[PDB]
Ligand binder design. Structure first.
Ligand SMILES: CC(=O)N[C@@H]1[C@@H](O)[C@H](O)[C@@H](CO)O[C@H]1O
Length: 499
């Protein structure tokens, strides 16, 4: 009965592991007459409508959302110790109530609710259920505030609808930030009015050749809006001064020798550089950052900084000294890859650590030192949470430069004690990046993102006391019939005892 169990899933069998699970009593059962009762506010109705949309196809129930009466599913905003993102979920014969201080907390409780319901909830046509929700109480708040997924749309372009699909994948696991890698050597993916060839020329291809693509400002705004409705803050990245061939190919004047390189369709890294010694470089960066900041309601702007291997170290330092303030000039907080730690992060900056177990002590120390100097740390180790990395030598997609990363390796660590010498309170959270050198359609993104994506979300969300591979893998195994019913391809790791 994998597909429609006789009994409800246990209250604690959700990912991320909730901070507190107190099972008891009889379950709630959704039936054809169940109403979704919300507060009389637009933002409460928005979460109710989102929930109703998730449940209508598989139940075939009306599930009206209203602000009157005693509905069997109640979403309510109230004072409580749940913070900006936490919630309480109460379940029993009298109904399900999700209580939070903010809409994002109600939204997170909905993500829990959809895992308490059975896998048939994922289907697009009406199903018998039964639509049971285990009885008891869950109280849940996040460990870290930076819980991020990245999608590379530079190596292969993914359009608005494909990004919305990826957004809905990550929303399941309470990620709250979406990092978009909007430019690299093989593509420039955001239209800039002051430099119109970036998109029309630099966006014209991708890895492997053929058509590429880019977002108009209207499309980018729609991605941001859709992400916001799934409580994801969009963090855009324009990588500089390396990984810049698409821009360089578009404007001859940006290049050291004044010659535009060809458009690049390979998969090498490290070979491109903005010209640090030319004034037009900083006009360009200021134009791009200013236009991107105007489209970005979130707090953060990512300037990259990785693999500027055609930029001599002293020039990289000078470049970063000059461009970091452009970000604050347009009202945003700088984020960069942890190479920025070698180039004097400005106050308030965060750096994203993509090192590995084998990274040298000196490099780790430079990052721990920036943490001591007040730089926030985002942890996305390339041998842990890079979702493009192969599971084993036989994986048919992805890369292997960081070694192989099976499911247990991806999950089985503690952000608080990961980087030697780094103060635990400098760790802002975690990110799971999905690079797309090898991935050109949404099914391939699913196969590499799943099943490690929920594990990185748990590292960002769950208390360290709940962390345990042997019991986590049981909760992970339980996702198989959900993913199967939803059409989500995933790697059936032999480490996981799949349901
Ligand atoms: C910060 C970073 O990750 N840089 C590159 C990235 O451009 C590339 O897509 C990835 C593939 O795993 O390998 C890294 O070396």
């Amino acid at each position: 009965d994998r597909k429609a169990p006789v009994r409800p899933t246990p209250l604690d069998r959700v990912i991320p592991a909730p901070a507190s699970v107190d099972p008891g009593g009889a379950p709630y059962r959704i039936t054809r007459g169940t109403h979704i009762r919300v507060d009389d506010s637009r933002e409460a109705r928005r979460v109710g409508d989102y929930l109703a949309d998730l449940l209508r196809p598989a139940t075939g129930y009306r599930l009206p959302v209203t602000a009157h009466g005693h509905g069997g599913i109640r979403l309510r905003l109230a004072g409580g110790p749940y913070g900006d993102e936490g919630y309480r979920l109460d379940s029993g014969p009298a109904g399900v109530t999700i209580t939070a201080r903010k809409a994002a907390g109600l939204f997170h409780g909905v993500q829990t609710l959809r895992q308490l319901l059975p896998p048939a909830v994922e289907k697009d046509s009406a199903q018998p259920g039964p639509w049971l929700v285990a009885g008891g109480t869950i109280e849940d708040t996040p460990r870290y505030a930076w819980r991020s997924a990245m999608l590379d749309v530079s190596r292969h372009f993914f359009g608005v609808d494909e990004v919305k699909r990826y957004i809905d994948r990550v929303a399941r696991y309470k990620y709250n930030k979406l990092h978009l890698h909007l430019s690299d050597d093989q593509g420039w993916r955001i239209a800039i009015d002051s430099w119109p060839r970036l998109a029309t020329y630099g966006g014209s291809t991708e890895v492997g050749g053929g058509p590429g693509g880019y977002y108009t400002k209207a499309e980018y705004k729609e991605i941001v809006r859709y992400a916001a409705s799934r409580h994801l803050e969009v963090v855009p990245e324009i990588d500089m001064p390396g990984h810049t061939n698409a821009a360089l190919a578009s404007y001859a004047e940006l290049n050291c020798d004044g010659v535009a390189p060809p458009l690049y369709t390979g998969t090498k890294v490290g070979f491109s550089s903005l010209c640090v010694d030319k004034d037009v470089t900083y006009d360009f960066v200021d134009d791009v950052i200013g236009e991107l900041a105007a489209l970005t309601p979130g707090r953060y702007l990512h300037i990259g900084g990785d693999e500027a291997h055609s930029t001599p170290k002293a020039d990289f330092v000078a470049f970063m000294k000059r461009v970091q303030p452009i970000v604050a000039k347009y009202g945003k907080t700088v984020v960069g890859w942890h190479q920025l730690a070698g180039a004097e992060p400005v106050e308030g900056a965060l750096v994203q650590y993509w090192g590995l177990d084998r990274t040298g002590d000196a490099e780790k120390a430079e990052v721990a030192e920036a943490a001591r100097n007040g730089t926030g740390l985002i942890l996305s180790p390339a041998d842990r949470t890079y979702l493009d990395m192969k599971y084993t030598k036989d994986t048919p997609l992805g890369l292997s430069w960081a070694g192989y990363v099976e499911v247990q390796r991806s999950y089985d660590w503690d952000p608080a004690g990961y980087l030697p010498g780094a103060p635990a309170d400098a760790v802002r959270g975690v990110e799971a990046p999905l690079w797309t050198e090898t991935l050109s359609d949404p099914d391939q993104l699913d196969y590499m993102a799943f099943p490690r994506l929920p594990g990185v979300a748990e590292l960002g969300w769950s208390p360290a006391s709940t962390h345990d591979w042997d019991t986590y893998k049981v909760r992970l195994a339980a996702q198989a019939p959900y993913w199967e019913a939803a059409g989500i391809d995933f790697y059936r790791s032999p480490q996981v005892p799949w349901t």
